[PDB]
């Protein structure tokens, strides 16, 4: 099972630099191209460049000349991209994708980069309790994106609605609902598991009634 494993989210001060990674497994890393793609929020995709370990060469899109620098570590089957002197427009999701050769077949999960002067802030989770019951969690005041939310460590995959976060004064606010039959709850536990990897935070809020 070919799979690419990218680094976690990053918060970069304006004018600073970041260097993300993309560790390959399930195939010979040195025998295939590695392409890097950028996707700004709610927008199309854009090819940054490639790196070919076989010939030890690379090549960039003119748009990213002087912004991107591609390297590799053959010993660890890991590709790296460095972005230098970042501005707010540089903030987006950055994908690595294996080349086939010049089209991209297997994509990474994507690394979220945020360029801002605001400092990292963890979320505050607040329970939302009231034939079929609906509960929820309010993930308020966190920064930067992203946050992942699950219910009962994933056991409640269906009937869930996690909503896109809203940005106010340099703080994100997200909400997630979950609908279950009237038997499991209050009778049984229903907790929302929130994760903010940017601040390395893991919160577990169990929804109970009053």
């Amino acid at each position: 099972q070919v799979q690419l494993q990218q680094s976690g989210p990053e918060l970069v001060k304006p004018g600073a630099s970041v260097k993300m990674s993309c560790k390959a497994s399930g195939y010979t890393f040195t025998d295939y191209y590695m392409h890097w793609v950028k996707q700004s929020h709610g927008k199309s995709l854009e090819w940054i460049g490639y790196f070919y370990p076989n010939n030890g060469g690379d090549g960039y899109n003119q748009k990213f000349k002087g912004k991107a620098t591609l390297t590799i570590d053959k010993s660890s089957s890991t590709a790296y991209m460095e972005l230098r002197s970042l501005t707010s427009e540089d903030s987006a999701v950055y994908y690595c994708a294996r080349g086939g050769d010049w089209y991209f077949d297997v994509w990474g999960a994507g690394t979220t980069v945020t360029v801002s002067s605001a400092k990292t802030t963890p979320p505050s989770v607040y329970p939302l309790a009231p034939s079929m019951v609906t509960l929820g969690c309010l993930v308020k005041g966190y920064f930067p994106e992203p946050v992942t939310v699950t219910w009962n460590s994933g056991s409640l995959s269906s009937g869930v609605h996690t909503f896109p976060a809203v940005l106010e004064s340099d703080l994100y606010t997200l909400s997630s609902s979950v609908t279950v039959p009237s038997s499991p709850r209050p009778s049984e536990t229903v907790t929302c598991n929130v994760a903010h990897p940017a601040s390395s935070t893991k919160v577990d809020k169990k929804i109970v009634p009053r």
């Binding site: 090819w47 994908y95 089209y103 929820g136 909400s175």
Partner: protein
């Protein structure tokens, strides 16, 4: 640079019907056109690659044709799972350029939202803030408004909304409206009402609660 022009920007089609997207290019790219599907929160998924090549594992509902400057992508007997974004990619010359993207939405029978209102928690009140969250889940079409009322009078300030993408199963939408107030601004009123007006009912779907429970 090879300019790829993908159209339409969005299109709505029923379940069993046929979808057809096209990408025109500024230059000749032989048949080096690739077609991706991207669902929310995921990376693009390669469906078709150079030469109209359907990747293994992809349903046969997807095909494509074209060469030189005119390419087309079609889905026969569409399904609810196909609701996503679709991008085309040229791998003929560098820089490799993507298309504008096409958002694909299911067209189904209207559905009324399941409105649920929630008072703020003691956790947030102890922190000095109050948020009234209302959930409007599983409705169609996406057009819908939310009125908030405190003690019987409408309020629009301090309201934040957000929608989800079309559900992959029932092809519906959901929204969360949050009314954020001060602790003492919240403690100075009793009845909070979440009002939802939808195409599925002339009378709005109202969900309220008094701060005396």
């Amino acid at each position: 640079e090879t300019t790829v022009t993908q159209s339409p920007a969005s299109l709505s089609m029923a379940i069993g019907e046929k979808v057809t997207i096209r990408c025109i290019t500024s230059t000749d790219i032989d048949d080096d056109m690739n077609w991706y599907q991207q669902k929310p929160g995921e990376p693009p998924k390669l469906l078709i690659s150079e030469g109209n090549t359907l990747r293994p594992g992809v349903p046969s509902r997807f095909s494509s044709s074209g060469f030189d400057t005119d390419f087309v992508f079609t889905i026969e007997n569409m399904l609810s799972e196909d609701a996503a974004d679709y991008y085309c990619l040229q791998s003929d010359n560098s820089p490799f350029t993507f298309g504008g993207g096409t958002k694909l939405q299911i067209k189904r029978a209207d559905a009324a939202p399941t409105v649920s209102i929630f008072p703020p928690s003691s956790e947030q009140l102890t922190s000095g803030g109050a948020s009234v969250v209302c959930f409007l889940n599983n409705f169609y079409p996406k057009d819908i408004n939310v009125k908030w009322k405190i003690d019987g009078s409408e309020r629009q300030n301090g309201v934040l909304n957000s929608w989800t993408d079309q559900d992959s199963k029932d092809s519906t939408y959901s929204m969360s409206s949050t009314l954020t107030l001060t602790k003492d601004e919240y403690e100075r009123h009793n009845s909070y009402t979440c009002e939802a007006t939808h195409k599925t009912s002339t009378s709005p779907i109202v969900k309220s609660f008094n701060r005396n429970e």
